[PDB]
Motif scaffolding. Structure first.
Motif, PDB file in Angstrom:
ATOM      1  N   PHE A  23       0.847  -1.178   0.000  1.00 38.22           N
ATOM      2  CA  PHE A  23       0.000   0.000   0.000  1.00 38.22           C
ATOM      3  C   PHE A  23       0.892   1.241   0.000  1.00 38.22           C
ATOM      4  CE2 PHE A  23      -3.489  -2.811   1.701  1.00 38.22           C
ATOM      5  CZ  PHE A  23      -4.432  -2.457   0.720  1.00 38.22           C
ATOM      6  N   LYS A  24       1.951   1.224   0.818  1.00 32.88           N
ATOM      7  CA  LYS A  24       2.911   2.314   0.938  1.00 32.88           C
ATOM      8  C   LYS A  24       3.635   2.593  -0.371  1.00 32.88           C
ATOM      9  CE  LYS A  24       6.603   1.618   3.387  1.00 32.88           C
ATOM     10  NZ  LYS A  24       7.581   1.609   2.279  1.00 32.88           N
ATOM     11  N   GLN A  25       4.144   1.547  -1.017  1.00 29.67           N
ATOM     12  CA  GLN A  25       4.861   1.693  -2.270  1.00 29.67           C
ATOM     13  C   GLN A  25       3.911   2.186  -3.360  1.00 29.67           C
ATOM     14  OE1 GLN A  25       8.741   1.147  -2.862  1.00 29.67           O
ATOM     15  NE2 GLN A  25       7.666   2.748  -3.961  1.00 29.67           N
ATOM     16  N   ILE A  26       2.683   1.644  -3.461  1.00 30.13           N
ATOM     17  CA  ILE A  26       1.723   2.094  -4.475  1.00 30.13           C
ATOM     18  C   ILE A  26       1.473   3.579  -4.217  1.00 30.13           C
ATOM     19  CG2 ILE A  26      -0.613   1.890  -5.476  1.00 30.13           C
ATOM     20  CD1 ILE A  26      -0.651  -1.036  -4.255  1.00 30.13           C
ATOM     21  N   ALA A  27       1.227   3.971  -2.963  1.00 27.49           N
ATOM     22  CA  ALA A  27       0.971   5.355  -2.591  1.00 27.49           C
ATOM     23  C   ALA A  27       2.134   6.257  -2.994  1.00 27.49           C
ATOM     24  CB  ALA A  27       0.697   5.428  -1.083  1.00 27.49           C
ATOM     25  N   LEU A  28       3.370   5.827  -2.737  1.00 28.58           N
ATOM     26  CA  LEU A  28       4.549   6.610  -3.068  1.00 28.58           C
ATOM     27  C   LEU A  28       4.697   6.758  -4.580  1.00 28.58           C
ATOM     28  CD1 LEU A  28       6.984   8.219  -2.052  1.00 28.58           C
ATOM     29  CD2 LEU A  28       8.221   6.071  -1.882  1.00 28.58           C
ATOM     30  N   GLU A  29       4.604   5.667  -5.340  1.00 22.11           N
ATOM     31  CA  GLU A  29       4.746   5.702  -6.795  1.00 22.11           C
ATOM     32  C   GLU A  29       3.597   6.438  -7.490  1.00 22.11           C
ATOM     33  OE1 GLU A  29       5.828   1.853  -8.652  1.00 22.11           O
ATOM     34  OE2 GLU A  29       7.821   2.621  -8.398  1.00 22.11           O
ATOM     35  N   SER A  30       2.386   6.368  -6.936  1.00 26.77           N
ATOM     36  CA  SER A  30       1.217   7.029  -7.503  1.00 26.77           C
ATOM     37  C   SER A  30       1.079   8.473  -7.021  1.00 26.77           C
ATOM     38  CB  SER A  30      -0.049   6.227  -7.165  1.00 26.77           C
ATOM     39  OG  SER A  30      -0.287   6.161  -5.775  1.00 26.77           O
ATOM     40  N   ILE A  37      -5.926   4.270  -1.633  1.00 27.02           N
ATOM     41  CA  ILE A  37      -5.773   3.019  -2.369  1.00 27.02           C
ATOM     42  C   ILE A  37      -6.667   1.953  -1.760  1.00 27.02           C
ATOM     43  CG2 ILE A  37      -4.055   1.275  -3.108  1.00 27.02           C
ATOM     44  CD1 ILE A  37      -2.030   3.773  -2.787  1.00 27.02           C
ATOM     45  N   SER A  38      -6.577   1.750  -0.450  1.00 26.21           N
ATOM     46  CA  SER A  38      -7.402   0.761   0.219  1.00 26.21           C
ATOM     47  C   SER A  38      -8.889   1.062   0.033  1.00 26.21           C
ATOM     48  CB  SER A  38      -7.021   0.681   1.704  1.00 26.21           C
ATOM     49  OG  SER A  38      -6.589   1.923   2.258  1.00 26.21           O
ATOM     50  N   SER A  39      -9.316   2.315   0.206  1.00 27.10           N
ATOM     51  CA  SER A  39     -10.724   2.669   0.066  1.00 27.10           C
ATOM     52  C   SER A  39     -11.215   2.523  -1.380  1.00 27.10           C
ATOM     53  CB  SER A  39     -10.954   4.069   0.633  1.00 27.10           C
ATOM     54  OG  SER A  39     -12.262   4.161   1.147  1.00 27.10           O
ATOM     55  N   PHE A  40     -10.367   2.832  -2.362  1.00 26.24           N
ATOM     56  CA  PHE A  40     -10.663   2.732  -3.781  1.00 26.24           C
ATOM     57  C   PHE A  40     -10.894   1.258  -4.097  1.00 26.24           C
ATOM     58  CE2 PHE A  40      -8.994   1.753  -8.045  1.00 26.24           C
ATOM     59  CZ  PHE A  40      -9.709   2.643  -8.861  1.00 26.24           C
ATOM     60  N   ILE A  41      -9.985   0.382  -3.655  1.00 22.24           N
ATOM     61  CA  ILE A  41     -10.082  -1.058  -3.862  1.00 22.24           C
ATOM     62  C   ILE A  41     -11.353  -1.556  -3.169  1.00 22.24           C
ATOM     63  CG2 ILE A  41      -8.952  -3.282  -3.325  1.00 22.24           C
ATOM     64  CD1 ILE A  41      -6.256  -1.744  -3.609  1.00 22.24           C
ATOM     65  N   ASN A  42     -11.593  -1.122  -1.927  1.00 23.54           N
ATOM     66  CA  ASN A  42     -12.762  -1.492  -1.130  1.00 23.54           C
ATOM     67  C   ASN A  42     -14.059  -0.953  -1.741  1.00 23.54           C
ATOM     68  OD1 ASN A  42     -10.893  -2.542   0.750  1.00 23.54           O
ATOM     69  ND2 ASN A  42     -11.241  -1.007   2.299  1.00 23.54           N
ATOM     70  N   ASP A  43     -13.997  -0.131  -2.801  1.00 25.71           N
ATOM     71  CA  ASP A  43     -15.152   0.476  -3.469  1.00 25.71           C
ATOM     72  C   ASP A  43     -15.984   1.206  -2.398  1.00 25.71           C
ATOM     73  OD1 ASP A  43     -17.294   1.060  -5.325  1.00 25.71           O
ATOM     74  OD2 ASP A  43     -18.023  -1.010  -5.234  1.00 25.71           O
ATOM     75  N   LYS A  44     -15.278   1.946  -1.529  1.00 24.49           N
ATOM     76  CA  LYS A  44     -15.797   2.722  -0.398  1.00 24.49           C
ATOM     77  C   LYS A  44     -15.246   4.149  -0.364  1.00 24.49           C
ATOM     78  CE  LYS A  44     -17.381   1.005   3.385  1.00 24.49           C
ATOM     79  NZ  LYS A  44     -17.333  -0.398   3.850  1.00 24.49           N
ATOM     80  N   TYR A  45     -14.298   4.477  -1.246  1.00 20.80           N
ATOM     81  CA  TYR A  45     -13.735   5.811  -1.292  1.00 20.80           C
ATOM     82  C   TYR A  45     -14.833   6.756  -1.756  1.00 20.80           C
ATOM     83  CZ  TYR A  45     -10.661   9.781  -2.157  1.00 20.80           C
ATOM     84  OH  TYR A  45     -10.089  11.016  -2.102  1.00 20.80           O
ATOM     85  N   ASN A  46     -14.967   7.899  -1.090  1.00 21.48           N
ATOM     86  CA  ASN A  46     -15.958   8.911  -1.412  1.00 21.48           C
ATOM     87  C   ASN A  46     -15.173  10.127  -1.885  1.00 21.48           C
ATOM     88  OD1 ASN A  46     -15.503   9.234   1.704  1.00 21.48           O
ATOM     89  ND2 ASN A  46     -16.548  11.130   1.159  1.00 21.48           N
ATOM     90  N   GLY A  47     -15.334  10.469  -3.157  1.00 20.44           N
ATOM     91  CA  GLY A  47     -14.666  11.578  -3.817  1.00 20.44           C
ATOM     92  C   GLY A  47     -14.605  11.285  -5.312  1.00 20.44           C
ATOM     93  N   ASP A  48     -13.666  11.897  -6.033  1.00 20.41           N
ATOM     94  CA  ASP A  48     -13.524  11.669  -7.472  1.00 20.41           C
ATOM     95  C   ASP A  48     -12.780  10.349  -7.675  1.00 20.41           C
ATOM     96  OD1 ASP A  48     -14.818  14.122  -7.976  1.00 20.41           O
ATOM     97  OD2 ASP A  48     -13.184  14.969  -9.178  1.00 20.41           O
ATOM     98  N   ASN A  49     -13.500   9.220  -7.636  1.00 17.26           N
ATOM     99  CA  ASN A  49     -12.904   7.893  -7.831  1.00 17.26           C
ATOM    100  C   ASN A  49     -12.260   7.803  -9.208  1.00 17.26           C
ATOM    101  OD1 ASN A  49     -13.102   5.630  -5.713  1.00 17.26           O
ATOM    102  ND2 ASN A  49     -14.988   6.782  -5.456  1.00 17.26           N
ATOM    103  N   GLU A  50     -12.811   8.503 -10.202  1.00 18.43           N
ATOM    104  CA  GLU A  50     -12.272   8.516 -11.557  1.00 18.43           C
ATOM    105  C   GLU A  50     -10.873   9.151 -11.568  1.00 18.43           C
ATOM    106  OE1 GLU A  50     -16.214   9.779 -13.664  1.00 18.43           O
ATOM    107  OE2 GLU A  50     -15.209   8.242 -14.898  1.00 18.43           O
ATOM    108  N   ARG A  51     -10.631  10.159 -10.721  1.00 17.23           N
ATOM    109  CA  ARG A  51      -9.319  10.799 -10.652  1.00 17.23           C
ATOM    110  C   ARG A  51      -8.307   9.748 -10.215  1.00 17.23           C
ATOM    111  NH1 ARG A  51     -10.130  16.155 -12.688  1.00 17.23           N
ATOM    112  NH2 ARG A  51      -7.948  16.826 -13.020  1.00 17.23           N
TER     113      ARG A  51
END
Length: 65
Positions: A23-30, A37-51
């Motif tokens: 999660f840390k490495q994905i966050a750093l590289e992205s 990342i976790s919330s996006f994968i969990n399909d629970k992130y609230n915001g511009d998921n498309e971004r």
């Protein structure tokens, strides 16, 4: 192929499942936050998921290449 958001998260799970990334490495590289990342994968992130999806695509592209 402009893969669906479902495909993007479906790939990230495989990588962390087999310790290919973290999660840390994905966050750093992205340049995104770890929690996103976790919330996006969990399909629970609230915001511009498309971004988030578009940023993660570029990351997956360099990873799988």
């Amino acid at each position: 192929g402009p893969m669906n958001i479902s495909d993007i998260r479906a790939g990230l799970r495989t990588l962390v499942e087999n310790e290919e990334t973290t999660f840390k490495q994905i966050a750093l590289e992205s340049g995104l936050s770890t929690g996103t990342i976790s919330s996006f994968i969990n399909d629970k992130y609230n915001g511009d998921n498309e971004r988030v999806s578009q940023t993660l695509q570029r990351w997956l592209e360099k990873y799988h290449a």
